[PDB]
Design a protein around this ligand. Structure first.
Ligand SMILES: Nc1ncnc2c1ncn2[C@@H]1O[C@H](COP(=O)(O)OP(=O)(O)O)[C@@H](O)[C@H]1O
Ligand SMILES: [Mg+2]
Length: 296
């Protein structure tokens, strides 16, 4: 009933603008060996390695589709995109160029239709976290002070003050995403995190599970003073045989608290670490490769 955080690396193509500025690829990517080489000498393996020619459907199948199955069994699941601004986190998460969220939701509604013995309800929330304050992207608006994050006796995360919207189909999900994304604007989204949470309630007793799709703030850098370092500390602890049997340090950030029942342990979690191949990005790409390695 227990599982490790799975780490995928997704390397995007060199963009036309990077090529026109004279940059070249610094990455040799070997997807069928599960590894990459940075520069001459730096080798990194990961559970999944996706090269520049892996399309969106391939990413979804490799990384995500197995989570959707656990979610329907009553497990909590989280997929989060990590990496520097410009590396492809939003393109990947998608919230045939569509990303993970629409693919996962299309499949979820088909599964609901297939399991005809169950009476299922799906509802969604969409939240932004910026400087440890929440904004509810689905609400006409809500004071940050009025949103609170709590935990029940059974260890379940409980949101207070957050709008939950029942959804019966992909079209309704897409409309809510469109609305929330427009509301986000009116502080630079590369600097904030977003969490789209899908809750599935199934009855023959009630079985409730959560699937979080997380597009993180940019990882670029100028102990544990940032939400990304808090997340790193949590996933490092989960991946370390000496630390993983002890208390996992979720309390240090709202991003790890909101995911506390969804991150490692009895839940299923995938981190997609996105990297630019550009030589101009070498240092931040190394940072990302090292961060992702700490989770394994
Ligand atoms: N796998 C990919 N294939 C092609 N283009 C991509 C890929 N990933 C990202 N891009 C492009 O790169 C740019 C940066 O992607 P974006 O998703 O905004 O990054 P981030 O959210 O990490 O800042 C966008 O113009 C996007 O369309
Ligand atoms: Mg983005």
């Amino acid at each position: 009933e227990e599982a490790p955080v799975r780490v995928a690396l997704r390397v995007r193509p060199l963009l036309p603008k990077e090529l026109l500025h004279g940059h070249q690829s610094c990455l040799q990517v070997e997807p069928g060996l599960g590894r990459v080489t940075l520069g001459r000498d730096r080798h990194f393996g990961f559970h999944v390695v996706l090269a520049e020619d892996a399309g969106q459907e391939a990413v979804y199948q490799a990384c995500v589709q197995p989570l959707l199955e656990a979610f329907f069994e009553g497990f909590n699941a989280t997929v989060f995109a990590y990496g520097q601004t410009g590396s492809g986190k939003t393109y990947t998460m998608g919230e045939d160029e569509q990303g993970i969220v629409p693919r996962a939701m299309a499949e979820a509604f088909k599964l609901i239709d297939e399991n005809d013995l169950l009476d299922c309800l799906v509802h969604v929330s969409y939240l932004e976290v910026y400087k440890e304050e929440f904004r509810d992207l689905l609400e006409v608006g809500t004071a940050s002070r009025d949103i609170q994050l709590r935990e029940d006796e059974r260890g379940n995360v409980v949101l207070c003050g957050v709008k939950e919207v029942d959804v019966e189909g992909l079209d309704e999900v897409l409309s809510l995403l469109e609305m929330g994304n427009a509301a986000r604007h009116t502080h630079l989204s590369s600097r904030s995190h977003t969490v789209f949470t899908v809750t599935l309630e199934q009855r023959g007793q009630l079985l409730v599970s959560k699937f979080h799709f997380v597009d993180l703030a940019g990882s670029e850098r100028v102990q544990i003073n940032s939400s990304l370092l808090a997340l790193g500390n949590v996933i490092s602890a989960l991946g370390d045989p000496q630390r993983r049997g002890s208390h996992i340090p979720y309390r240090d950030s709202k991003i790890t608290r909101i995911l506390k029942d969804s991150l490692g342990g009895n839940a299923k979690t995938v981190m997609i670490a996105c990297v630019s191949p550009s030589s101009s990005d070498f240092d931040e790409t190394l940072n990302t490769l090292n961060y992702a390695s700490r989770a394994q």
